[PDB]
Amino acid sequence: GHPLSLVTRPDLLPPAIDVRESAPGTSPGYVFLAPKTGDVLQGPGTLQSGPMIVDNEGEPVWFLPRGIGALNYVTAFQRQTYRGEPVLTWWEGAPLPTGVGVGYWVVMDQSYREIARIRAGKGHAGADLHDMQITPDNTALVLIAEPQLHRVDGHARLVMNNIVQEIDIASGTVLHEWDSLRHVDVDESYLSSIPLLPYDYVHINSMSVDTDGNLLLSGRNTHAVYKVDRHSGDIIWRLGGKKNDFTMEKGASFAWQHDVSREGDGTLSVFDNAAAGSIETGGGAPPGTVSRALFLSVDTEARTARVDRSYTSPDGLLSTSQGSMQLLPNGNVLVGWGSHGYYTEYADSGEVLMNASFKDPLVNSYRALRFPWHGRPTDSPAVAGRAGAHGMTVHASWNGATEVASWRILAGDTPQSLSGVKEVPKDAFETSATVAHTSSYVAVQALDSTGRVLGTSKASRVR
Ligand SMILES: [Mg+2]
Ligand SMILES: [Mg+2]
């Protein structure tokens, strides 16, 4: 059971989260999630989906119920930077039965207003859902996944081509385009053939910029990371896979991986699912295999790779798809367990600091990522007053507000004769408070930690 019931916001039913552990040293800031449920037919009836920012207790801070099952599927929510400003980004669109999506990426500023929409170049239906990254030059790496007739074993075969476009965000112009079928051979795939589906031979699911400005592309179904020349498109090297360029130390190989990036300590992070579904692979996976969040010491001059350090779930999870990892500024590591609706923050030493899961066991998030966030909502707090036997309860919330520390409660016989009766700390998304004297109207003011008024609700008739 996940639905959170809110007196002030009957329209918001955010999924509940169970935080089973929260030692001190957990990082500040917020966890960014896009809760979803896979069922096309029943999804909308069991879950309100959309981007969600929660605190270290699992309480929502902002929730935008934008997702509609598989009608408007929302995923891959995070914070990025555009023109030096913090922005929110996610994908919304149509998930297709072939395993890819057709949609676009929303860009929203700190006041929760849409400032741009990042689309695949014209001549394509839209962009796939597995990643989009805003580069230091304010261009977007976008992925297009489309079926294409290709010669596979002398006999033509429908294959899922992956095209990576670099898009100037302000203008929408395509600056660069990289076509996987022109560079990566279909026989590099580990994927078992699934009858009557396009052969999803590479399945790019992460695109990022390395320190030299070239691209790093994670190919799930080739088990490989491609470094690609930013300008020529030539493959610079292959890490992993059937044409591996690197000498791998014991334990450094990954499989069916996600979320690859260059990290500030010089390592390359790889979420190593270590397994996929039974059909897409040969059959089941070896008993006892688990997923790991992996930091690789990759020496590209010597073409060697070894494990610097890794982190596994305290719950023994094997995630057959999705997932994420993030190195945080204090040295902590946050891991989202993908197909499993869990996320875990560790100290560098590997000690579990925070472990959480969706209360509903069918809900998960593609990624779970932590960022500072300062919301600047442009609406007002919502309020509600409920008369009781010997008093009344006042409820207050302000979706998107991050700086509310306290609530001042106002009450009076008329909207124009409200007076301050009480101040209480904020202790939830929606905070409740009881007051002895029941009045006819109420309002609330949100106060920051210095006591300054951030916003005021409308007057609300008690009920
Ligand atoms: Mg070579
Ligand atoms: Mg990552």
Coordinates of C-alpha atoms and ligand atoms in Angstrom, one line a residue:
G1 CA 0.0 0.0 0.0
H2 CA 1.6 3.2 -1.2
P3 CA -1.1 6.0 -1.5
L4 CA -0.4 9.0 0.7
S5 CA -3.6 10.7 1.8
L6 CA -3.4 14.5 2.0
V7 CA -6.1 16.7 3.3
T8 CA -4.8 19.8 1.5
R9 CA -4.1 18.1 -1.8
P10 CA -6.6 15.3 -2.6
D11 CA -5.2 15.4 -6.1
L12 CA -1.8 14.0 -5.0
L13 CA -1.3 10.4 -4.0
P14 CA 2.4 9.9 -4.0
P15 CA 3.8 6.4 -3.5
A16 CA 5.0 5.7 0.0
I17 CA 8.6 4.8 0.8
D18 CA 9.9 2.6 3.7
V19 CA 13.3 3.9 4.9
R20 CA 14.6 0.8 6.8
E21 CA 17.9 2.4 7.9
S22 CA 19.2 6.0 8.2
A23 CA 22.5 6.2 10.0
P24 CA 24.2 9.7 10.4
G25 CA 26.5 10.6 7.6
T26 CA 23.8 10.2 5.0
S27 CA 24.3 13.1 2.6
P28 CA 22.2 16.2 2.6
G29 CA 20.0 17.1 -0.4
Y30 CA 17.2 15.0 -1.9
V31 CA 16.6 11.7 -3.7
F32 CA 15.1 12.1 -7.2
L33 CA 12.8 9.3 -8.3
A34 CA 10.3 8.6 -11.1
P35 CA 8.1 5.9 -9.6
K36 CA 6.4 3.7 -12.1
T37 CA 4.7 0.3 -12.3
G38 CA 5.1 -1.8 -15.4
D39 CA 1.5 -3.1 -16.0
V40 CA 0.1 -1.5 -19.1
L41 CA -3.5 -2.5 -18.3
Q42 CA -3.7 -1.8 -14.5
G43 CA -0.9 0.8 -14.1
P44 CA -3.0 4.0 -13.9
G45 CA -5.4 2.4 -11.3
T46 CA -2.7 1.4 -8.8
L47 CA -0.1 4.3 -9.1
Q48 CA 0.2 8.0 -9.7
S49 CA 3.5 8.3 -11.5
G50 CA 5.7 11.2 -12.2
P51 CA 8.9 12.9 -11.0
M52 CA 9.3 12.9 -7.3
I53 CA 11.9 14.6 -5.0
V54 CA 11.9 13.0 -1.5
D55 CA 14.0 13.6 1.7
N56 CA 16.1 11.1 3.6
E57 CA 13.0 9.9 5.4
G58 CA 11.2 9.1 2.2
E59 CA 8.8 12.1 2.6
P60 CA 7.9 13.9 -0.6
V61 CA 9.2 17.4 -1.1
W62 CA 7.9 17.8 -4.7
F63 CA 5.6 15.5 -6.7
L64 CA 4.2 16.2 -10.1
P65 CA 1.6 13.5 -11.1
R66 CA 2.4 13.7 -14.7
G67 CA 2.7 10.0 -15.6
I68 CA -0.2 8.0 -16.8
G69 CA 0.8 4.3 -16.9
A70 CA 1.9 3.6 -20.4
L71 CA -0.1 6.5 -22.0
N72 CA 2.3 9.1 -20.7
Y73 CA 5.2 7.1 -19.3
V74 CA 7.6 9.2 -17.2
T75 CA 11.1 8.1 -16.3
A76 CA 14.8 9.0 -15.9
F77 CA 14.2 12.1 -13.6
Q78 CA 17.2 13.9 -12.4
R79 CA 18.8 17.4 -11.9
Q80 CA 21.1 18.7 -14.6
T81 CA 22.7 22.1 -15.4
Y82 CA 21.7 24.3 -18.3
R83 CA 23.5 27.6 -18.8
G84 CA 24.9 27.3 -15.4
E85 CA 21.5 26.9 -13.8
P86 CA 20.0 23.9 -11.9
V87 CA 17.3 22.4 -14.0
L88 CA 15.0 19.3 -13.7
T89 CA 14.8 16.9 -16.6
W90 CA 12.8 13.8 -17.4
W91 CA 11.5 11.8 -20.3
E92 CA 7.8 11.4 -21.1
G93 CA 6.3 9.5 -24.0
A94 CA 5.0 6.2 -25.3
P95 CA 6.8 3.0 -24.2
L96 CA 6.8 0.5 -27.1
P97 CA 6.6 -3.3 -26.8
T98 CA 10.0 -3.6 -28.6
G99 CA 11.6 -2.3 -25.4
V100 CA 12.3 1.3 -26.4
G101 CA 10.2 4.5 -26.2
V102 CA 9.2 7.4 -28.4
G103 CA 9.0 10.7 -26.5
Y104 CA 10.9 13.9 -25.5
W105 CA 12.7 15.3 -22.5
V106 CA 11.2 18.0 -20.3
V107 CA 13.5 20.8 -18.9
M108 CA 12.1 22.7 -15.9
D109 CA 13.7 25.4 -13.8
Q110 CA 13.7 26.0 -10.0
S111 CA 10.2 27.5 -10.1
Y112 CA 8.8 24.3 -11.7
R113 CA 8.2 26.0 -15.0
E114 CA 9.0 24.3 -18.3
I115 CA 11.8 26.2 -20.1
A116 CA 12.6 23.8 -22.9
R117 CA 11.7 20.5 -24.6
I118 CA 14.5 18.4 -26.0
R119 CA 13.4 16.4 -29.1
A120 CA 15.2 14.0 -31.5
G121 CA 16.0 15.7 -34.8
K122 CA 13.2 15.9 -37.4
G123 CA 12.9 12.9 -39.5
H124 CA 12.5 10.6 -36.4
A125 CA 9.3 10.0 -34.5
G126 CA 11.0 10.9 -31.2
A127 CA 13.7 10.0 -28.6
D128 CA 14.2 6.9 -26.6
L129 CA 13.8 7.0 -22.8
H130 CA 17.1 5.4 -21.5
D131 CA 19.2 8.5 -21.2
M132 CA 19.7 12.2 -22.1
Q133 CA 22.6 14.2 -20.8
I134 CA 23.1 18.0 -21.0
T135 CA 26.8 18.6 -21.9
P136 CA 29.0 21.4 -20.6
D137 CA 28.3 23.2 -23.9
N138 CA 24.5 23.2 -23.4
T139 CA 23.9 20.5 -26.0
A140 CA 21.9 17.4 -25.3
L141 CA 23.0 13.8 -26.0
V142 CA 19.8 12.1 -27.2
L143 CA 19.2 8.5 -28.2
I144 CA 17.0 7.3 -31.1
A145 CA 16.1 3.6 -31.3
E146 CA 14.3 2.4 -34.5
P147 CA 13.9 -0.9 -36.3
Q148 CA 16.0 -1.3 -39.4
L149 CA 16.4 -4.0 -42.0
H150 CA 19.9 -5.4 -41.7
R151 CA 21.8 -8.3 -43.1
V152 CA 22.3 -10.7 -40.1
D153 CA 23.9 -14.0 -41.1
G154 CA 23.4 -13.6 -44.8
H155 CA 19.7 -13.3 -44.3
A156 CA 18.1 -9.9 -43.8
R157 CA 16.9 -9.3 -40.2
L158 CA 15.0 -6.6 -38.4
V159 CA 17.4 -4.9 -36.0
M160 CA 17.0 -2.1 -33.5
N161 CA 19.4 0.6 -34.6
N162 CA 20.6 3.0 -32.0
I163 CA 21.4 6.6 -33.2
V164 CA 23.0 9.1 -30.8
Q165 CA 22.4 12.7 -31.7
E166 CA 24.0 15.8 -30.1
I167 CA 21.3 18.5 -30.2
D168 CA 21.8 22.2 -29.6
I169 CA 19.1 22.7 -27.0
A170 CA 18.2 26.4 -27.6
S171 CA 17.7 25.9 -31.3
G172 CA 16.9 22.2 -31.6
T173 CA 19.6 21.8 -34.4
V174 CA 21.3 18.5 -34.8
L175 CA 25.1 19.0 -34.5
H176 CA 26.4 15.4 -34.7
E177 CA 24.8 12.0 -35.3
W178 CA 26.3 8.6 -34.6
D179 CA 24.7 5.5 -36.1
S180 CA 25.4 2.3 -34.2
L181 CA 24.9 -0.1 -37.1
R182 CA 27.7 1.7 -39.0
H183 CA 30.2 1.1 -36.2
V184 CA 29.1 -1.8 -34.0
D185 CA 28.5 -5.2 -35.7
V186 CA 25.4 -7.1 -34.9
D187 CA 27.5 -10.2 -34.0
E188 CA 29.0 -8.3 -31.0
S189 CA 25.6 -8.8 -29.2
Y190 CA 25.1 -11.3 -26.4
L191 CA 21.3 -11.2 -26.8
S192 CA 19.4 -14.4 -27.5
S193 CA 17.0 -14.0 -30.4
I194 CA 13.4 -13.4 -29.3
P195 CA 11.0 -14.5 -32.1
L196 CA 9.0 -11.7 -33.8
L197 CA 10.8 -8.8 -32.0
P198 CA 13.4 -6.5 -33.7
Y199 CA 16.8 -7.7 -32.5
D200 CA 17.8 -5.2 -29.9
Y201 CA 21.5 -6.0 -30.4
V202 CA 23.3 -3.2 -28.6
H203 CA 20.7 -1.3 -26.5
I204 CA 22.5 1.9 -25.5
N205 CA 21.4 3.0 -22.1
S206 CA 23.9 5.7 -21.0
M207 CA 25.6 8.5 -22.9
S208 CA 28.1 10.9 -21.2
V209 CA 31.1 13.0 -21.8
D210 CA 34.5 11.9 -20.7
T211 CA 37.2 14.4 -19.5
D212 CA 38.7 14.7 -22.9
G213 CA 35.3 15.7 -24.4
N214 CA 34.7 12.4 -26.2
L215 CA 31.6 10.3 -25.6
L216 CA 31.1 7.2 -23.4
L217 CA 28.2 5.0 -24.6
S218 CA 27.0 2.0 -22.5
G219 CA 25.7 -0.8 -24.6
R220 CA 23.7 -3.2 -22.4
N221 CA 23.3 -6.1 -24.8
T222 CA 26.9 -6.1 -26.0
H223 CA 28.2 -5.8 -22.4
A224 CA 30.5 -3.0 -23.6
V225 CA 31.3 0.7 -23.1
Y226 CA 32.2 2.5 -26.3
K227 CA 34.4 5.6 -26.3
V228 CA 33.4 7.6 -29.4
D229 CA 35.1 10.5 -31.0
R230 CA 33.0 13.6 -30.4
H231 CA 33.6 14.9 -33.9
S232 CA 34.4 12.0 -36.2
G233 CA 32.2 9.3 -34.7
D234 CA 35.0 6.7 -34.8
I235 CA 35.0 4.2 -32.0
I236 CA 38.1 5.0 -29.9
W237 CA 38.0 1.9 -27.8
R238 CA 35.7 -0.9 -26.5
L239 CA 35.7 -1.7 -22.8
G240 CA 34.1 -5.1 -22.3
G241 CA 32.3 -7.3 -24.7
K242 CA 33.3 -9.7 -27.5
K243 CA 35.8 -7.2 -29.0
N244 CA 37.2 -6.0 -25.7
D245 CA 40.3 -3.8 -26.1
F246 CA 41.2 -4.0 -22.4
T247 CA 43.0 -6.6 -20.3
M248 CA 40.6 -7.2 -17.4
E249 CA 41.7 -8.1 -13.9
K250 CA 39.8 -10.8 -12.1
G251 CA 36.3 -9.5 -11.2
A252 CA 36.3 -6.5 -13.4
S253 CA 34.1 -7.8 -16.2
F254 CA 30.5 -6.5 -16.2
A255 CA 27.4 -7.7 -18.0
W256 CA 24.1 -6.2 -19.0
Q257 CA 25.3 -3.0 -17.4
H258 CA 23.7 0.5 -16.9
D259 CA 24.7 4.0 -16.0
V260 CA 28.3 4.5 -16.9
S261 CA 30.3 7.7 -16.2
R262 CA 33.7 9.2 -15.5
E263 CA 33.9 10.1 -11.8
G264 CA 35.9 12.8 -10.1
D265 CA 38.4 10.4 -8.5
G266 CA 39.4 9.2 -12.0
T267 CA 37.5 6.0 -11.8
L268 CA 34.8 4.8 -14.3
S269 CA 31.5 3.9 -12.6
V270 CA 29.4 1.1 -14.0
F271 CA 26.2 -0.3 -12.5
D272 CA 26.9 -3.9 -13.2
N273 CA 23.4 -5.6 -13.3
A274 CA 25.5 -8.8 -13.9
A275 CA 22.3 -10.4 -15.3
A276 CA 19.3 -9.9 -17.6
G277 CA 16.0 -11.7 -18.1
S278 CA 15.9 -15.4 -18.7
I279 CA 14.7 -15.2 -22.3
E280 CA 17.1 -12.5 -23.5
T281 CA 20.0 -14.5 -22.1
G282 CA 20.4 -18.2 -22.5
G283 CA 18.4 -19.1 -19.5
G284 CA 18.5 -18.4 -15.8
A285 CA 21.6 -16.8 -14.2
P286 CA 24.0 -18.7 -12.0
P287 CA 22.5 -19.1 -8.5
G288 CA 23.9 -16.6 -6.1
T289 CA 24.7 -13.9 -8.6
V290 CA 23.9 -10.3 -7.4
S291 CA 24.2 -6.9 -8.9
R292 CA 26.9 -4.5 -7.9
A293 CA 27.7 -0.8 -8.2
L294 CA 31.3 -0.9 -9.6
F295 CA 34.1 1.7 -9.7
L296 CA 36.7 0.6 -12.2
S297 CA 40.3 1.8 -12.3
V298 CA 40.5 2.1 -16.1
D299 CA 44.0 2.9 -17.5
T300 CA 43.3 3.8 -21.1
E301 CA 47.0 4.3 -22.1
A302 CA 47.9 0.7 -20.9
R303 CA 44.3 -0.6 -21.7
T304 CA 43.9 -2.3 -18.4
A305 CA 41.0 -2.4 -16.0
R306 CA 40.6 -3.6 -12.5
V307 CA 38.1 -3.2 -9.6
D308 CA 38.9 -0.2 -7.4
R309 CA 35.8 -0.9 -5.2
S310 CA 32.3 -2.2 -5.4
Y311 CA 29.0 -2.2 -3.4
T312 CA 26.3 -4.8 -3.3
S313 CA 22.8 -4.6 -1.8
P314 CA 22.3 -5.6 1.8
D315 CA 19.1 -7.3 0.5
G316 CA 20.9 -9.6 -1.9
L317 CA 19.3 -8.0 -5.0
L318 CA 19.8 -9.2 -8.6
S319 CA 18.5 -6.4 -10.9
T320 CA 17.8 -7.8 -14.3
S321 CA 17.3 -4.3 -15.8
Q322 CA 17.6 -0.6 -15.0
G323 CA 19.6 0.9 -12.0
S324 CA 22.0 3.6 -11.2
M325 CA 25.0 4.6 -9.1
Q326 CA 26.4 7.9 -8.1
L327 CA 29.5 9.1 -6.3
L328 CA 28.6 11.9 -3.9
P329 CA 30.7 14.9 -2.9
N330 CA 31.3 13.5 0.7
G331 CA 32.5 10.2 -0.7
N332 CA 29.3 8.3 -0.2
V333 CA 27.8 6.2 -2.9
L334 CA 24.1 6.1 -3.7
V335 CA 22.8 3.1 -5.7
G336 CA 19.3 2.6 -7.3
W337 CA 18.5 -1.0 -7.7
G338 CA 16.5 -0.6 -10.9
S339 CA 14.0 -3.4 -11.5
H340 CA 13.9 -3.7 -7.7
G341 CA 12.3 -0.7 -6.1
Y342 CA 15.1 -0.1 -3.6
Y343 CA 17.9 2.4 -3.1
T344 CA 20.9 2.4 -0.8
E345 CA 23.4 5.0 0.3
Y346 CA 26.8 3.8 1.5
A347 CA 29.8 5.3 3.1
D348 CA 33.0 5.0 1.0
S349 CA 34.0 2.2 3.4
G350 CA 30.9 0.2 2.3
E351 CA 28.9 0.7 5.5
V352 CA 25.2 0.9 4.8
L353 CA 23.9 4.4 5.9
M354 CA 20.5 4.5 4.2
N355 CA 18.3 1.7 2.7
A356 CA 14.8 2.3 1.4
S357 CA 12.2 0.6 -0.7
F358 CA 8.8 1.6 -2.1
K359 CA 6.1 0.3 0.2
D360 CA 4.3 -1.1 -2.9
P361 CA 6.4 -4.0 -4.1
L362 CA 5.4 -3.5 -7.7
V363 CA 6.7 0.1 -7.8
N364 CA 10.2 0.9 -8.9
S365 CA 12.3 3.8 -10.4
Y366 CA 14.7 3.5 -13.3
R367 CA 17.3 5.6 -11.3
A368 CA 17.7 6.9 -7.8
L369 CA 19.9 10.0 -7.7
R370 CA 20.7 12.6 -5.0
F371 CA 21.2 16.3 -5.5
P372 CA 20.9 19.5 -3.6
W373 CA 17.7 21.4 -4.6
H374 CA 16.3 24.8 -3.8
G375 CA 12.7 25.1 -5.1
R376 CA 11.2 28.5 -5.8
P377 CA 7.5 27.7 -6.1
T378 CA 5.3 30.5 -7.6
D379 CA 2.0 29.3 -6.2
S380 CA 1.0 29.4 -2.5
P381 CA 0.8 26.9 0.4
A382 CA -2.4 24.8 0.6
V383 CA -4.3 24.7 3.8
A384 CA -7.2 22.9 5.4
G385 CA -9.1 23.3 8.7
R386 CA -11.1 20.4 10.2
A387 CA -13.4 20.9 13.2
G388 CA -13.2 18.3 15.9
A389 CA -15.0 17.4 19.2
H390 CA -13.1 19.9 21.4
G391 CA -11.1 21.7 18.8
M392 CA -9.8 21.7 15.2
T393 CA -6.9 20.5 13.2
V394 CA -5.1 22.6 10.6
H395 CA -3.3 21.0 7.7
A396 CA -0.6 22.6 5.6
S397 CA 1.6 21.8 2.6
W398 CA 3.4 23.5 -0.2
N399 CA 4.4 21.1 -3.0
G400 CA 7.8 22.1 -4.3
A401 CA 8.9 24.3 -1.4
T402 CA 12.3 23.2 0.1
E403 CA 13.0 25.9 2.6
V404 CA 9.9 25.7 4.8
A405 CA 11.0 25.2 8.4
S406 CA 7.9 26.2 10.3
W407 CA 4.2 27.0 9.8
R408 CA 2.4 29.9 11.4
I409 CA -1.3 29.2 11.8
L410 CA -3.9 32.0 11.4
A411 CA -7.5 31.8 12.5
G412 CA -10.4 34.2 12.7
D413 CA -14.2 34.6 12.2
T414 CA -13.7 36.1 8.7
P415 CA -11.0 35.9 6.0
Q416 CA -10.1 39.5 6.9
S417 CA -9.9 39.0 10.7
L418 CA -7.3 36.2 10.7
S419 CA -4.8 36.3 13.6
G420 CA -1.8 34.2 14.4
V421 CA -2.6 31.5 17.0
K422 CA 0.3 29.1 16.8
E423 CA 3.6 28.2 15.1
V424 CA 4.7 24.6 14.6
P425 CA 7.7 23.0 13.0
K426 CA 7.2 21.4 9.6
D427 CA 7.5 17.6 10.1
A428 CA 6.0 16.1 6.9
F429 CA 5.0 16.9 3.3
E430 CA 1.7 17.8 4.9
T431 CA 2.0 18.9 8.5
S432 CA -1.0 18.7 10.9
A433 CA -1.5 20.7 14.0
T434 CA -4.3 21.0 16.6
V435 CA -5.6 24.2 18.1
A436 CA -8.0 24.4 21.0
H437 CA -10.4 27.1 19.8
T438 CA -12.3 26.2 16.6
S439 CA -12.7 29.1 14.3
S440 CA -14.6 29.8 11.0
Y441 CA -11.6 30.4 8.7
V442 CA -7.9 29.5 8.8
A443 CA -4.8 30.2 6.8
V444 CA -1.1 29.4 7.1
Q445 CA 2.2 31.1 6.5
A446 CA 5.3 29.1 5.6
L447 CA 8.5 30.3 7.5
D448 CA 12.1 29.6 6.7
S449 CA 14.6 28.8 9.4
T450 CA 15.3 32.5 10.1
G451 CA 11.5 33.1 10.6
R452 CA 10.9 35.0 7.3
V453 CA 7.6 34.5 5.5
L454 CA 8.0 32.5 2.3
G455 CA 4.4 32.4 1.3
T456 CA 0.8 32.6 2.5
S457 CA -2.2 30.3 1.8
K458 CA -5.6 31.6 0.9
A459 CA -8.2 31.9 3.6
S460 CA -10.0 28.5 3.9
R461 CA -13.4 27.9 5.6
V462 CA -13.1 25.4 8.4
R463 CA -14.9 22.1 7.8
Ligands
MG1 MG 40.9 -0.5 -31.9
MG2 MG 25.9 7.3 -12.5

